[PDB]
């Protein structure tokens, strides 16, 4: 058999544009943790997960319990994660809404997934097979991703580093320009607009403008639940049939269900269906028609496959949600999406917004050609951890002065009167 | 350089089956089954066991030829292949006669996928040197509990083509109690399931009482195979009080099962009204059943069974596993998936006590059941090897028995000429 001998949880941080969202605005650096496991016969499995204080704490408490364990026994791993979290109680019940790493409800799922992806990568190296083959084989050889557009300011407050190439985007012109730039460099066939920040009427106009500038392109809008139902309706009337799907315009299962019933539009979510019980409750109300998968908080890659199959059973579409991430997450997203027959929609990604120098794998930033990630025959995730690069971002983590993400606190540096509201509009 | 399949061997067989009575009628002196052998370019062998009726074989055979030279990890390929093959095939079965587990035309893709899926995974496990369960995330338990599956039976098959079985007849409480005792003594089962909806329901109730009297603290269950009307089911519930752990399919249909539950609050189990994922959805909408008895053979294999277990957990339903008229291969595939599921709520179902000592296709003969359990070990894959001599022998008994499709209804007509497939009879 086989046994794990060394587990390394490494918190890191990397630069992030001043991206606007419903909560406020992104901080100069985004947190992350990098997982690396190693076996008695010298094989390495990589993992990537949330870096926020609560999530780190669990990862660090789990790691020490993993030495001398069979990497096939994911069931035992789950049991251990469940023991660790049960012993941590009580825990803070309100974290940052848009940062799943700070969600108490996802304590077990976040932690189990962090190591699950590493355990399977290990298994795949040992077998000399790409990761997707452990999951049942590639259904497709290229996974399409979408263009993740943000409204943004020119630069971060107090200029912590050198301003970015993109520049500000606060009008339909610059949004188009931002998209044009994205699609050229990466080849995306689908467009998503992060909304809930600028006035809704204006945010709608930015999508119309993308219709003209990019006809035949699937369009997605995501106010992250920051619009009331009344507003969600009025905006649906202006949008018509321009969207591929209408993602979390209004909060709550009941509000979503009422919105769909009244407008007929296909709704997607990553906020009202985030676990299996929420799926059960959604299905009973017909709240959503598409569910965004995310392996990071849904409890891993196999759990994501389980969700996809349930979505199929209940007549729901399957898409994919993202948080700022590097190469290990990207390959992980791609590998599981490549293995599920009914993931038609293009997966969301943050990759374009991350800097080329600040990647943690060998070979620099991974390639997205034709808006798709290629699934090669390289064993596991087909990735090697650049240790010098790791140390650099680990050290940047120590100096950034950030331990848990807060978009609300960050926007308060710009408007002092800013308070979290939901739904704002 | 990917590992690849070189050889596939589908092999039909028949084994002595007792005169076991059920809702539909009575077992034939023989019962059919198919054995799957897979081999890889590097000499590893994966095993399978499935349905042995003519139309199933025909499907297995059709798919068999397509398998050579393909990556045994690429199960998604294997699925697309089974679908294409089934699409190029007429049903060739009347819907009224689809009465046995897995017989429904809709199960075509699932039965055929499951047949090979097991062998594909048993293959992977042999190549990895790990037990199969490890492919499925690891063993939650090392022992899988099972019940004693009790049947009413006649002493012998009419115009029998061999010596009568050693069990004798079982048509009253005394003979049933004795039949259970035999099984409990031999195998150590800690729970009991009676195959019902065969004799008058008042008589069958009395047989449960006698079993409860003879064996206290033994959880008791029945499967009347939907052969009781709603009113009968209700009258029986009254007479039984709380003698039973659960009732499996006492009354037919999603609507009847739901109504029965509403009217009594009793825990209802099924392997009739929830047999696939669409049925699961419709059941959950009506709250028809509280417990799903999975069966990897028709649900689509081992990974699909895990999906099902997870779905039951999600919707607050109990899960347990099941297999009928099967050999050791099935028993192990079932046990292994049963071993990887956290939410195993009840002892599993097996026919294995009925299979004759001399009629297995594996080295060692009949697998051990100690303390009413099956041990999961560190042996690679299923940890089983084909006795090619026993294989050839039972393939010959297939050729000579003259049964190509099971028919408990025709078979019963030899004892009672006026017999029809009534449901619910009582
Ligand atoms: K969202
Ligand atoms: Mg049954």
Question: Can you walk me through this structure?
Answer:
Two copies of one chain form a homodimer. By secondary structure, chain A is an alpha/beta fold. Chain A contains 14 helices and twelve strands. In chain A, the strands form three sheets. Chain A has a seven-stranded parallel beta sheet, with helices on one face. In chain A, α1 crosses α3, α2 runs antiparallel to α3 (107-127) and α7 runs parallel beside α8. The longest helix of chain A has 21 residues, at 107-127. The radius of gyration of chain A is 21 Å and the shape is globular. The relative contact order of chain A is 0.17. Chain A binds chain B through residues 1, 70, 72-76, 78, 127, 129, 133-134, 136-139, 276-277, 279-280, 302, 306, 309-310, 312-314, 339, 341, 377, and chain B through 2, 71, 73-77, 79, 128-130, 134-135, 137-140, 277-278, 280-281, 303, 306-307, 310-311, 313-315, 340, 342, 378. Magnesium ion (MG) binds next to loops of chain B. Chain B: Residues 173-267 form the Mandelate racemase/muconate lactonizing enzyme C-terminal domain. Chain B: One of its GO terms (molecular function) is glucarate dehydratase activity. Chain B: Belongs to the mandelate racemase/muconate lactonizing enzyme family. GlucD subfamily. Chain B: Its cofactor is Mg(2+).
Percentage beta strand of chain A:
5-15%
> Number of helix segments of chain A?
14
CATH superfamily grouping of the largest domain in chain A: Enolase-like C-terminal domain
Remind me, CATH topology of the largest domain in chain A? TIM Barrel
Instruction: Give the name of the CATH architecture of the largest domain in chain A.
Output: Alpha-Beta Barrel
Shape, principal axes of CA atoms of chain A? globular
Oligomer: homodimer
Molecules bound to protein: potassium ion, magnesium ion
- Count up the domains of chain A: 2
CA-CA gap between termini of chain A: 58 Å
Largest interface: A-B, 30 and 32 residues
Biggest sheet of chain A, in brief? 7 strands, parallel
Q: Write down the secondary-structure element order of chain A.
A: EEEHHHHEEHEHEHEHEHEHHEHEHH
Number of strands of chain A: 12
Q: Order of strands side by side in the largest beta sheet of chain A?
A: 5-6-7-8-9-10-11
Alpha carbon gyration radius of chain A: 21 Å
CATH class of the largest domain in chain A: Alpha Beta
Structural class of chain A: alpha/beta
Indicate the percent of residues in helices of chain A: 25-40%
């Amino acid at each position: 058999s086989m046994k794990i001998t060394r587990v390394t949880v490494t918190p890191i941080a990397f630069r992030d544009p001043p991206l606007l969202n419903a909560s406020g605005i992104h901080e100069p650096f985004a947190l992350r943790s990098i997982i690396e496991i190693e076996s008695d016969n010298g094989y390495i499995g990589l993992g990537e997960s949330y870096g926020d204080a609560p999530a780190l704490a669990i990862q660090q408490q789990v790691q020490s319990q993993l030495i001398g364990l069979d990497p096939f026994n994911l069931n035992q791993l789950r049991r251990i994660v469940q023991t660790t979290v049960a012993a941590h109680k009580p825990a803070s019940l309100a974290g940052a809404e848009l940062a799943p790493g700070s969600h108490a409800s996802k304590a077990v799922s976040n932690a189990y997934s962090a190591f699950e992806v590493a355990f399977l990568d290990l298994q795949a190296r040992y077998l000399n097979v790409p990761l997707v083959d452990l999951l049942g084989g590639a259904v497709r050889d290229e996974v399409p991703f979408s263009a993740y557009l943000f409204f943004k300011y020119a630069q971060h407050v107090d200029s912590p580093y050198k301003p970015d190439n993109w520049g500000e985007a606060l009008n339909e012109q610059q949004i188009v320009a931002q998209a044009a730039r994205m699609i050229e460099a990466y080849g995306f066939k689908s467009i998503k607009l992060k909304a809930g920040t600028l006035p809704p009427e204006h945010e709608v106009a930015c999508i119309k403008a993308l219709k003209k500038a990019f006809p035949g392109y699937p369009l997605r809008i995501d106010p992250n639940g920051n619009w009331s139902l009344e507003t969600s309706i009025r905006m649906a009337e202006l949008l018509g049939d321009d969207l591929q799907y209408y993602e979390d315009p209004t909060p709550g299962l009941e509000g979503m269900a009422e919105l769909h019933k009244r407008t007929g539009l296909p709704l997607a979510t990553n906020m009202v269906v985030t676990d299996f019980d929420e799926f059960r409750r959604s299905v009973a109300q017909n709240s959503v028609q598409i569910v965004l998968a995310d392996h990071h908080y849904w409890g891993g890659l196999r759990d994501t496959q389980t969700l996809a199959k349930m979505c199929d059973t209940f007549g729901l579409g399957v898409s994919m949600h993202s948080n700022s991430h590097l190469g290990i997450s990207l390959m992980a997203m791609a590998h599981v999406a490549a293995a599920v027959p009914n993931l038609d929609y293009a997966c969301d990604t943050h990759y374009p917004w991350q800097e080329p120098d600040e990647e943690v794998i060998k070979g620099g930033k991974l390639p997205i050609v034709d808006g798709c990630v290629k699934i090669t025959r390289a064993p596991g995730l087909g990735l090697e951890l650049d240790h010098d690069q790791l140390g650099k971002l680990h050290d940047q983590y120590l100096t950034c002065g950030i331990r848990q993400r807060d978009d609300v606190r960050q926007m308060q540096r710009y408007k002092p009167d800013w308070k979290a509201l939901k739904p704002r509009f």
